[PDB]
């Protein structure tokens, strides 16, 4: 951006663009490094975190800010619930709270959670 304002017949602008494209190619060559993925993948530039709150008390009661820190069952519960919410939102036509395509297929959804927590997912 700074070089775009220089009056040198597109020399500084060319150099800065060269640096940027070199960065882009470096990322492309190592197309699975965390840095490259963050640089060139929309869903890698931002983190993700879940927070369980109180229905009436709005203060966060338990905030997993990534914070893996969880047993297999807890992670399975969180993932199943989040996927269910995502599917519900996706299948719901815009402006409607009831999906029109109401069938969803799960394949060995639950394997790390006890029978008591699986019922909650269902």
């Amino acid at each position: 951006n700074a070089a775009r304002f220089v009056d040198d017949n597109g020399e500084s602008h060319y150099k800065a663009l060269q640096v940027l494209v070199a960065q882009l190619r470096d990322a492309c060559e190592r197309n699975r490094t965390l840095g490259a993925k963050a640089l060139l993948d929309p869903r890698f530039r931002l983190e993700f975190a879940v927070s369980v709150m109180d229905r009436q008390s709005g203060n966060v009661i338990e905030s997993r800010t990534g914070s893996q820190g969880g047993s297999g069952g807890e992670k399975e519960i969180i993932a199943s619930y989040v996927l269910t919410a995502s599917l519900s939102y996706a299948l719901c036509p815009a402006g409607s709270r009831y999906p029109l395509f109401g069938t969803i297929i799960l394949d060995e959804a639950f394997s790390r959670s006890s029978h008591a927590v699986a019922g909650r997912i269902i």
């Binding site: 395509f101 109401g102 069938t103 269902i122």
Partner: protein, 122 residues
């Protein structure tokens, strides 16, 4: 418990049938019904379950990921060609070059029915 059961099929389309013909290992014509209050596909491992899921996903998606249940993370081993031909790569013991169940001219049909308040979409 039962009262909520009636909500499904009222404001949404719910799958209520699947039909297959020479799909995967389902030689001939097979029909499977689905209940409006959820359904479970059960059986000995490696009989037909992922084949059913893959048939439905083919009916639904443009480039379905076959066997995403077990091959998740890397490329799927199966493809549409194999399902139509009914190869049995995994199942061996006398394998005569993969046991192509239908090598010659063949036709395979897969149909899925969805219902909502008496309205059918196949």
């Amino acid at each position: 418990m039962n009262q909520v059961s009636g909500l499904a099929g009222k404001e949404s389309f719910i799958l209520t049938r699947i039909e297959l013909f020479n799909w995967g290992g389902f030689h001939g014509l097979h029909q499977a019904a689905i209940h409006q209050d959820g359904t479970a596909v059960i059986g000995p491992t490696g009989s037909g379950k992922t084949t059913l899921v893959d048939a439905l996903m083919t009916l639904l998606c443009a480039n379905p990921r076959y066997n995403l249940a077990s091959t998740g993370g890397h490329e799927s081993d199966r493809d549409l060609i194999s399902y139509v031909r009914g190869v049995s790569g995994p199942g061996d013991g006398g394998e005569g070059q993969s046991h192509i169940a239908r090598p010659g001219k063949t036709v395979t049909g897969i149909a899925a029915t969805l219902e909502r308040e008496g309205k059918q979409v196949r």
